[PDB]
């Protein structure tokens, strides 16, 4: 039975033969009748949809309103229980859910369940948080956000009842907003350009939207309010006063949301014949996007349902829904530091959407793609990688069909420029999901030079090599020996005939082994597995490990995907370690490929494996806590935690070193600092922070004391300062 | 518990490299085995973590590889 009511509450507002009003009133009557034996359950159930289905906010407040109208005491217990849940959500650092609870309490005012002065009082308290001393800006930010973002719903009523009080709250809010640090902004913007659309700090944007709403006398044109149909039933006589609410003090364990920048790509001129798009500074735009993001959050696991829910998103008036959907999806995908959900979901979601609205959505997506391409010049590198990975994957689902001619402007540009580079990287990704000649053929002849090279093996000692090369005879012996399926000892024996950690031994061995298993990943994998002993012996030192990577690259430089899987396999089987890979990434041999995606794909895959290894061992250790072992395993975790910390130390050190070298040389020569190479480098450093923020936060003291010091060149130090600002 | 998927409806020319590329979008792949012999248009994709296999089921399943709509399902039991 308790499961039945949960179903009625959760499904109300969905597809129905009856009107929403009918079902709400009907549901109200059903819930009332079960108050005697299910009150406590119904309370919890309603408190739950309030925190979990914010997209359905006004449907549920209306329900609570009707319920309260039937039973005043119950409403009092609900409001009481909502305040409890809010305190608790705030305690568990679920500031996201807390916002929805505040919004619910806010809209309840409109339903006359809660008296307006109660929310005015609560908001006075939220805003006083900005007056607290020595607390993180992100803390003050959140209370201000929770307040302002509630106003599209309850602004009008609060202003009607307590205009003077509200004005004071706004005065205090604005003064807080004017003194906020904006240090985090550059690290979170998808584009740095101001045109055509500034990427606005979220509170600055929201404040501007609220000012517009105020100027419009708190009237907005989008929010559906089912309660307006029950005006006879709902009335002020049914209001409750809230118990005092004091925002829990900031502690050590308090975790506040990072600040955000508003993704913005469309305006009314992009759909010049449709319903006028709500402007960037309208609360309609804010609410639409917030709800759309909430819908994705509720249905991300089910792409078909997710697409359906987005396409059926209702609103008081006509809006260019397809634009809002596509815009919100790219807002998520390009969100910094990370999308709310796994990247690949967005790709398949857009495909579901295209299938669902075949006559309208594809045009918009194609228009959006053109615009993203045309704005590449100042797009942050992290977002460009996602754009590249998205677009290539998307193309592979539509027979790799694209009008490349639209992008001919990239052809005459510096190949290092964002546009031609994006194109080359996209074509490289396409090839990985296809075949070389196939991709060579999808582009116009004018683009042929941007196509990836045939991923062929390069064998140093092949039928063309001069027998004068060092170890040439041994290489041959190894070759024939490998065919005869020799044993490790047999190979060892041959290698001993090499003069000089023996770099030549490594070279003739790796070149020969890799060349012979060059047919497939599987062959290369089993070859590495078979002669593991040889690798471990030849690459026992750090120099050895680096030289293996170096020779491997000399062999497979035309095949980045092979390099990636080889590095990964070598790490997993300990032929090399992550420190060696990090050193290899920043090596002179990789200098000409340093800005390419594959390098960063490997670096991050390497970091991720290190992180997961730490988590894995930590888990085993914890598991033994519940059960000479538990302690001995504790040594493995400290070593892993050390390897991990050291990985980051090295990566940051290398970045500091090469950026300093560039910065120094630009001053010396009086040349421009801002080159394509620099754009990549600094944004790649930024990306280390963004992708691994949670892990890096434990190294803050060390990083600040050893590497990102006050004397560090400001271009570099700013990145660390921007990162710190994410939680300051 | 299972972290492995059967993949079906693959084109005859689809390679392990292409499967690596596509399926890596949902997570890190431990092993790929082409064919139906774990020791025809089928292959096995094993992930290190269950969450990654679930995301392949959610987002890779039902999309294209060599213009063919592939199908995935758990290799369990």
UniProtKB/Swiss-Prot annotation, chain A:
GO molecular function: molecular adaptor activity; mRNA binding; RNA 7-methylguanosine cap binding; RNA binding; RNA cap binding
One example of a Gene Ontology biological process annotation: alternative mRNA splicing, via spliceosome
N6-acetyllysine: residues bearing it: 178, 636
Signal sequence interval, chain numbering: none
Keyword terms: Acetylation, Coiled coil, Cytoplasm, Isopeptide bond, mRNA capping, mRNA processing, mRNA splicing, mRNA transport, Nonsense-mediated mRNA decay, Nucleus, Phosphoprotein, RNA-mediated gene silencing, Translation regulation, Transport, Ubl conjugation
A Pfam family matched in the record: MIF4G
Phosphoserine PTM sites in chain numbering: 175
Localization terms from the record: Nucleus; Cytoplasm
Coiled coil: 605-651
A GO cellular-component term linked to this record: cytoplasm
All residue ranges annotated as the MIF4G domain in the record: 2-214
Transmembrane feature ranges: none
Task of the protein: Component of the cap-binding complex (CBC), which binds cotranscriptionally to the 5'-cap of pre-mRNAs and is involved in various processes such as pre-mRNA splicing, translation regulation, nonsense-mediated mRNA decay, RNA-mediated gene silencing (RNAi) by microRNAs (miRNAs) and mRNA export. The CBC complex is involved in mRNA export from the nucleus via its interaction with ALYREF/THOC4/ALY, leading to the recruitment of the mRNA export machinery to the 5'-end of mRNA and to mRNA export in a 5' to 3' direction through the nuclear pore.
Name this protein carries in UniProt: Nuclear cap-binding protein subunit 1
Gene3D superfamilies: 1.25.40.180
Family, per entry: Belongs to the NCBP1 family.
SUPFAM superfamilies to which the protein is assigned, alphabetical: ARM repeat (SSF48371)
Subunit structure: Component of the nuclear cap-binding complex (CBC), a heterodimer composed of NCBP1/CBP80 and NCBP2/CBP20 that interacts with m7GpppG-capped RNA. Found in a U snRNA export complex containing PHAX/RNUXA, NCBP1/CBP80, NCBP2/CBP20, RAN, XPO1 and m7G-capped RNA. Identified in a IGF2BP1-dependent mRNP granule complex containing untranslated mRNAs. Interacts with PHAX/RNUXA, SRRT/ARS2, EIF4G2, IGF2BP1, HNRNPF, HNRNPH1, KIAA0427/CTIF, PARN, DROSHA, UPF1 and ALYREF/THOC4.
Curated annotation (Swiss-Prot), chain B:
Binding site for mRNA: 6, 71-75
UniProt effect for mutating residue 44 to A: Impairs mRNA cap-binding
Localization (cell): Nucleus; Cytoplasm
Domain RRM: 3-77
Outcome following mutation: residue 6 to A: Abolishes mRNA cap-binding
Impact reported for residue 9 to A: Does not affect mRNA cap-binding
Signal peptide: none
Protein's job: Component of the cap-binding complex (CBC), which binds co-transcriptionally to the 5' cap of pre-mRNAs and is involved in various processes such as pre-mRNA splicing, translation regulation, nonsense-mediated mRNA decay, RNA-mediated gene silencing (RNAi) by microRNAs (miRNAs) and mRNA export. The CBC complex is involved in mRNA export from the nucleus via its interaction with ALYREF/THOC4/ALY, leading to the recruitment of the mRNA export machinery to the 5' end of mRNA and to mRNA export in a 5' to 3' direction through the nuclear pore.
Similarity annotation: Belongs to the RRM NCBP2 family.
Assembly description: Component of the nuclear cap-binding complex (CBC), a heterodimer composed of NCBP1/CBP80 and NCBP2/CBP20 that interacts with m7GpppG-capped RNA. Found in a U snRNA export complex with PHAX/RNUXA, NCBP1/CBP80, NCBP2/CBP20, RAN, XPO1 and m7G-capped RNA. Interacts with PHAX/RNUXA, EIF4G1, HNRNPF, HNRNPH1 and ALYREF/THOC4/ALY. Interacts with SRRT/ARS2 and KPNA3.
Official protein name in the record: Nuclear cap-binding protein subunit 2
Gene giving rise to this polypeptide: NCBP2
Residues of the full protein shown: 38 to 118 of 156
């Amino acid at each position: 039975t308790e499961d039945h009511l949960e179903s009625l509450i959760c499904k109300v507002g969905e597809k129905s033969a009856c009107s929403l009003e009918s079902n709400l009133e009907g549901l109200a009557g059903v819930l009332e009748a079960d108050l005697p034996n299910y009150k406590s359950k119904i309370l919890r159930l309603l408190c739950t949809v309030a925190r979990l289905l914010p997209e359905k906010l006004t449907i549920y407040t209306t329900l609570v309103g009707l319920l309260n109208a039937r039973n005043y005491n119950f409403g009092g217990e609900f409001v009481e229980a909502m305040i409890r849940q809010l305190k608790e959500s705030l305690k568990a650092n679920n500031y996201n859910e807390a916002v929805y609870l505040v919004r619910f309490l806010s809209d309840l005012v409109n339903c006359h369940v809660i008296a307006a002065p109660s929310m005015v009082a609560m908001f006075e308290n939220f805003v006083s948080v900005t007056q607290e001393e020595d607390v993180p800006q992100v803390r003050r930010d959140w209370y201000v956000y929770a307040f302002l973002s509630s106003l599209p719903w309850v602004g009008k009523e609060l202003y009607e009842k307590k205009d003077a009080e509200m004005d004071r709250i706004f005065a205090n809010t604005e003064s807080y907003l004017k003194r906020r640090q904006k240090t985090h902004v550059p690290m979170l913007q998808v584009w740095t350009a101001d045109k055509p659309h500034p990427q606005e700090e979220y509170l600055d944007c929201l404040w501007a939207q609220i000012q517009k709403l105020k100027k419009d006398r708190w009237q907005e044109r989008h929010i559906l309010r089912p309660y307006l149909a029950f005006d006879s039933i709902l009335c002020e006589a049914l209001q409750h006063n809230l118990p005092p609410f004091t925002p829990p003090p900031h502690t050590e364990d308090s975790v506040y949301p990072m600040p955000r920048v508003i993704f913005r790509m469309f305006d009314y001129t992009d759909d010049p014949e449709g319903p006028v798009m709500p402007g960037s500074h309208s609360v309609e735009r804010f609410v639409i996007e917030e709800n759309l993001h909430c819908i994705i959050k509720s249905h991300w696991k089910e792409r078909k349902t997710c697409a359906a829910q987005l396409v059926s998103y209702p609103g008081k008036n006509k809006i260019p829904l397809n634009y809002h959907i596509v815009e919100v999806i790219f807002a998520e995908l390009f969100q910094l530091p990370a999308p709310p959900h796994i990247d690949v979901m967005y790709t398949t979601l857009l495909i579901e959407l295209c299938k669902l609205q075949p006559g309208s959505l594809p045009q918009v997506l194609a228009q959006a793609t053109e615009m993203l391409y045309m704005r590449l010049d100042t797009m942050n590198t992290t977002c460009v990688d996602r754009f590249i990975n998205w677009f290539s994957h998307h193309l592979s689902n539509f027979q790799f069909r694209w009008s490349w001619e639209d992008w001919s402007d990239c052809l005459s540009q510096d190949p290092e420029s964002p546009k031609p580079k994006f194109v080359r990287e996209v074509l490289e990704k396409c090839m990985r999901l296809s075949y070389h000649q196939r991709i060579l053929d999808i582009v116009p002849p004018t683009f042929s030079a941007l196509c990836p090279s045939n991923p062929t093996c390069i064998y140093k000692y092949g039928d063309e090599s001069s027998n004068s090369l060092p170890g040439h005879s041994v290489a041959l012996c190894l070759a024939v020996a490998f065919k005869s399926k020799a044993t490790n000892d047999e190979i060892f024996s041959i290698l001993k005939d090499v003069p000089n950690f023996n770099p030549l031994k490594i070279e003739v061995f790796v070149q020969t082994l890799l060349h012979l298993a060059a047919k497939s990943f599987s062959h290369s994998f089993s070859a590495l597995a078979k002669f593991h002993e040889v690798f471990k012996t030849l690459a026992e030192s750090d120099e050895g490990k680096l030289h293996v990577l170096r020779v491997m690259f000399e062999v497979w430089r035309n095949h980045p995907q092979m390099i990636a899987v080889l590095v990964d396999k070598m790490i997993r089987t300990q032929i090399v370690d992550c420190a060696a890979v990090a050193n290899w990434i920043f090596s002179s041999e990789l200098s000409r490929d340093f800005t390419r995606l594959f390098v960063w794909e490997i670096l991050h895959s390497t970091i991720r494996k290190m992180n997961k290894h730490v988590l894995k061992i930590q888990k085993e250790l914890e598991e033994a806590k519940e059960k000479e072992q538990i302690e001995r395993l504790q040594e493995k975790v400290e070593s892993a935690q050390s390897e991990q910390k050291n990985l980051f130390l090295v990566i940051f050190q290398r970045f500091i070193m090469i950026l300093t070298e560039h910065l120094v040389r630009c001053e010396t020569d009086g040349t421009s600092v801002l080159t394509p190479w620099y754009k990549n480098c600094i944004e790649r450093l930024q990306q280390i922070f963004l992708q691994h923020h949670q892990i890096i936060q434990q190294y803050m003291v060390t990083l600040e004391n050893l590497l990102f010091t006050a004397e560090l060149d400001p271009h570099i130090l700013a990145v660390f300062q921007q990162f710190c600002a994410l939680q300051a | 518990k299972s972290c492995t998927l059967y993949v079906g409806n693959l084109s005859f020319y689809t390679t392990e490299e292409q499967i690596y590329e596509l399926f890596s979008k949902s997570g890190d792949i431990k092993k790929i085995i082409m064919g139906l012999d774990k020791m025809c248009g089928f292959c096995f994709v094993e992930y290190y973590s269950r969450a990654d296999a679930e995301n392949a089921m959610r987002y890779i399943n039902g999309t294209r590889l060599d213009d063919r709509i592939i199908r995935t399902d758990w290799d369990a039991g």
